[PDB]
Design a binder for this molecule. Structure first.
Ligand SMILES: C[C@H]1O[C@H](O[C@H]2[C@H](O)[C@@H](O)[C@@H](O[C@H]3[C@H](O)[C@@H](O)[C@@H](O)O[C@@H]3CO)O[C@@H]2CO)[C@H](O)[C@@H](O)[C@@H]1N[C@H]1C=C(CO)[C@@H](O)[C@H](O)[C@H]1O
Length: 388
């Protein structure tokens, strides 16, 4: 017997949310005495909304779609139910290891993996063909390509998202850098790779290879890509269905995807994704654990991919012929296997804010790449007291 209310806060976007609400309410098929109360909470509001509710014990959800960085964030302040030895964990070993690391805090499991992701370079196949160019493998080749795309088609080569710090990471990795050396507790973002990365992004916009905006970046990016204003953008699996809604990409066929470009030293893209957690103060714990088990089951992960092309965390699901043949999946899974894994620390998501501010000021010309990198590092040393 399961019964009662299970309130689920989902952060999925406008293209994803009808699918996730249907999946959530499908828990009631097998458990008709449970009432699933689906709520969609915008991504940028959800961390604060959950903390406010959990800290007040007031209108907190039973189950929270928890970003990979949010697990240690929320768990560090006691807001998540530990899951070890509960029915929430079924076939745990099925999950990709890097997925499983984000679920852990101080030797306890506080979430179950849902989707895994990384950033990639999406491109308009027809524009590149019309421009006579190949999909660029590096920043250097992207600049050459962008000039041909402007000269032959009038589009801009790249929409470079300028208001979300996560988009700095491919450039950092491509210049040979990283945020921190975790094993050695050393801040590394202000090494010369960080200077070079800020410089590359500024050059892409100044040279007119790319355009950007200081606000409303998600909408501006998607609108520029879908309208053919740009030929390329960096984005993740959560954009696929949104892009395919557009006249230009109905023909799933016109939507190309490739790795983010290499920089002067190498290439990399960050690992991201979503897990599912239970609020520590839930008044319907059995029903919530079962709900988490259901939402993370192989069946529901397979359905998510079939409807949205989001990537499963469960290895078995890749073997299901239907997942094994989705062309967005066949590209993204190897890219995810290569993606760079961050420190899963309480302060992890706070590492993004200094990048946000310094990247904005580099793009507007208020701050040099040199000063931006040093400022980022200074902010990290303040955030991480036992880092040098
Ligand atoms: C800045 C943000 O970057 C990283 O998060 C990325 C997620 O891992 C991706 O999955 C993707 O999230 C989208 C979901 O897939 C989608 O279903 C829907 O929820 O919309 C999401 C946004 O489009 O993209 C994210 C990057 O945009 C990183 O891992 C994450 O921790 C970072 N978030 C921090 C930054 C801010 C504000 O700058 C806060 O709002 C967050 O609470 C922080 O955690």
């Amino acid at each position: 017997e399961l019964s009662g209310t299970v309130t689920f806060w989902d952060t999925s976007n406008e293209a994803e949310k009808a699918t996730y609400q249907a999946l959530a309410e499908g828990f009631e098929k097998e458990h008709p005495k449970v009432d699933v109360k689906y709520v969609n909470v915008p991504f940028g509001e959800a961390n604060a909304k959950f903390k406010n509710a959990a800290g007040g014990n007031s209108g907190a959800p039973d189950v929270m779609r928890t970003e990979v960085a949010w697990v240690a964030d929320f768990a560090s302040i006691g807001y998540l139910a530990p899951l070890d030895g509960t029915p929430a964990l079924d076939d745990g070993s099925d999950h990709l290891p890097q997925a499983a690391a984000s679920t852990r805090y101080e030797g306890k499991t506080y979430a179950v993996p849902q989707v895994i992701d990384t950033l990639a370079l999406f491109y308009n196949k027809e524009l590149l063909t019309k421009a006579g160019v190949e999909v660029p493998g590096s920043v250097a080749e992207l600049k050459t390509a962008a000039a041909e795309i402007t000269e032959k088609t009038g589009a801009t080569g790249l929409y470079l998202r300028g208001d979300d710090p996560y988009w700095f990471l491919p450039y950092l990795y491509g210049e040979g850098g990283d945020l921190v050396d975790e094993k050695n507790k050393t801040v590394t973002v202000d090494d010369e790779a960080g200077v070079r990365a800020y410089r590359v992004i500024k050059d892409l916009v100044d040279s007119k290879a790319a355009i950007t905006d200081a606000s409303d970046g998600w909408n501006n990016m998607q609108n520029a890509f879908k309208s053919g204003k740009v030929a390329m953008m960096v984005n993740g699996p959560w954009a696929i269905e949104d892009v395919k809604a557009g006249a230009r990409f109905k023909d799933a066929g016109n939507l190309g995807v490739a790795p983010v470009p290499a920089g002067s030293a190498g290439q990399g893209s960050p690992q991201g994704g979503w897990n599912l957690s239970v609020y520590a103060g839930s008044k319907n714990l059995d029903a919530s654990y079962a709900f988490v088990k259901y939402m993370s089951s192989a069946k529901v992960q397979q359905q998510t991919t079939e409807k949205l092309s989001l990537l499963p965390t469960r290895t078995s699901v890749y073997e299901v012929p239907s997942v094994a043949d989705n062309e967005m999946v066949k590209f993204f899974k190897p890219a995810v296997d290569k993606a760079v894994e961050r420190p899963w620390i309480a302060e992890g998501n706070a590492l993004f804010e200094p990048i946000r501010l310094q990247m904005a000021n580099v793009l507007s010309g208020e701050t040099s790449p040199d000063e931006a990198a040093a400022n980022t590092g200074d902010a990290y040393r303040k955030l991480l007291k036992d880092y040098k």
